Assembly symmetry: C2
Amino acid sequence: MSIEKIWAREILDSRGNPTVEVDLYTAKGLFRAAVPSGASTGIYEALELRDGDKQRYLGKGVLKAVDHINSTIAPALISSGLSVVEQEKLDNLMLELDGTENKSKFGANAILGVSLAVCKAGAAERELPLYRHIAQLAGNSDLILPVPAFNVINGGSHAGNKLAMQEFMILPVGAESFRDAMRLGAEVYHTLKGVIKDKYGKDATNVGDEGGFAPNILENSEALELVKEAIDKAGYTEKIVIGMDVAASEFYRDGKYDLDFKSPTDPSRYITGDQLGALYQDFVRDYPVVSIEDPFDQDDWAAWSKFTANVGIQIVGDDLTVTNPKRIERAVEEKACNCLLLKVNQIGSVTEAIQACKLAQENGWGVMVSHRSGETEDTFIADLVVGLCTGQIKTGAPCRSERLAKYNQLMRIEEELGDEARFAGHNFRNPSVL
Amino acid sequence: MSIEKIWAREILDSRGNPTVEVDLYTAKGLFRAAVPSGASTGIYEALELRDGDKQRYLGKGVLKAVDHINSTIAPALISSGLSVVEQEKLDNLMLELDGTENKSKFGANAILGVSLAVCKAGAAERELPLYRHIAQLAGNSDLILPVPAFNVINGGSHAGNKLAMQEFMILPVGAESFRDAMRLGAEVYHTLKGVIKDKYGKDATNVGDEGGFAPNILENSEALELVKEAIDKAGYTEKIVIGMDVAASEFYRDGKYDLDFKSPTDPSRYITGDQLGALYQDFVRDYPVVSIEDPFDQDDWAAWSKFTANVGIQIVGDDLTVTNPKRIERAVEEKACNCLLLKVNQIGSVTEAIQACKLAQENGWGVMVSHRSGETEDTFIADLVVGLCTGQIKTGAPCRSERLAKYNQLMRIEEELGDEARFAGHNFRNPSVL
Ligand SMILES: [Cl-]
Ligand SMILES: [Cl-]
Ligand SMILES: [Mg+2]
Ligand SMILES: [Mg+2]
């Protein structure tokens, strides 16, 4: 039925920075959701609203976004009399009320927070589990549990090591179930900790923002060997496969790519995108690498299209698609990649995230639901990846509970589905065949 | 009313290790609670039950504890027809079915999981928030919000550095509210990150299990100077004081203490308890140290009593008391300390945890509700510290959401209390005066 009350507030995300949380009240009770960390800048992605008061949290407060929800958005959604099940009606109503392209008036963080609470409220109004309600919102009926991608080795701008490539992930594609995929990822993560401890010292086992280790490693080959070693030490050689998030936009320097970018700028090491693909092909031929994210710059479309047709593995767009539908339309016709990274807070609403996913799915693309580096204890994307039938989610290492809360919820979803549960397994790119 | 169903399962904690989760159903719905990591061996404390299957999670599985809940504990509590408000009855009934003193048959994790879920369900049966139901179980009426103690610098066993003492904490005693205390902690925490990255390098900024930093330093005095420097640069010298957990059992050897342990062994550097107390005295005099946990070994009673009687600061028992009433009785008699650390899973029952807290407060002790090194997304202890009117809690750095979940939940309790909300402030040791 109607929305009776909406109250928002400030909370701290997994890094100690402010973010938006929204309580939405209907007749059925309280429905709470929180928003992961995004960017208040950028041409394409929707922008979170930050206060900018440097005395307070060094300008990262979200008091203005919280106020936009409580004072302006709440009375508008209450007056509409719309049922909480009408997800697209409510999301479009807040889109026009904001009236901007990138949601810059209220902030993508303010709009998403209400949109997520609406969906949870509409799921209980439907007497459905959240993942089921999302599936009906997306026109799906056969549900699937995704293959998790655990960030276990970090580099690039994320860590103090000279390692240029951002994320080295593990995919338990050979697991019996999702709960079994957790045991595989967790045991390999614990094995990797001992490998790093013995090889690099006891001080090298502390973790980054999403729970992965950051040993002072120069070259990515040793990162892949390190992961490869831990998989084999744990005894899961053919059950677990490696995925990569290069984030090559971070070290695109002077037209070339600098995988020694923590150094004083020096022309001596930078190589061309063509030569970068040769290292990738050597990565793919030497290592079980099935997925590479941001292999080139967000505007170096020539190398992107040239790499996708040349290769057969999954190439996922993060910085070049920014969950932006019109940018995705370009990458389709340009065949720059074959997989979409779905950061719901980069687009700002549940409706637009569903349509962005279905847009990629109708074009034979894969989709990978993604966390943010700044997360909360919210577990919405766990139900999201099940209802969207995406088949693949990355939401951190099996360490730090802003990551495990999603993984734990996916295990609860599998247990609830029971015999109707399907694990994507080796079909994480196209789970619609199971 | 009667319990309809109790279903237990295995989830991953913040380190990636399995732990117990319990779903309890009544006519008012589902009530969920997860257990933090405890200990499986120990002479005094309640013991968690581990599977021991070295092939599965390296023996860390809790399938046996889960089976004890689903097969044995659940049928008996439902058969009793006891109302879920009867916390003491249901906890007692589980204590006798287990039949052992340290909860070693069913496991302290199995018994606590049910006990927590019973408490959340009892609060809804009373149509009260959880913290207010805990207050009525403890015989309290006027609630208090605690001063947070944020772990910020780490040494001891769980750190790769040379630093002997375990934790260095910050306490925003001068804050205006709990929410302001979260702002002060986060701003100092982020400030110290900058001071560490500038002095020790960008690779020294990663975090341990509790969310704090662990730079490679040997002198405990340097750690205190680091924290003091971060407090001053944030501009909060007036408002933030320092607490310590030395965890002296870790470097207690034959009859001395080795502050250069986790190093090549040399008994010549060993220092006596008097020498260690003199080092503490210089800390209190040179730094705003207001609290010291485990200053001496778990059985060095003479050092405890002598140091407590010759000092004015708070002296916290952790390994000394292990949340055990008989150990607390001896600690009160010999005046070994003046503050109890309350780890709920170290005692294994809500009813007994309330007893252990009311025993300490009756003797003029302070109480500090505590997290564990392995936490979950559960937030029970946030409502617990408020309901027990304890005035102080340590549940991590303002980093990693297994820590922020309690801190955010305390912020929610503060705004729900409205004008009735009181911040312990400078009376965190004796909040009853407010
Ligand atoms: Cl990110
Ligand atoms: Cl602990
Ligand atoms: Mg990325
Ligand atoms: Mg301790």
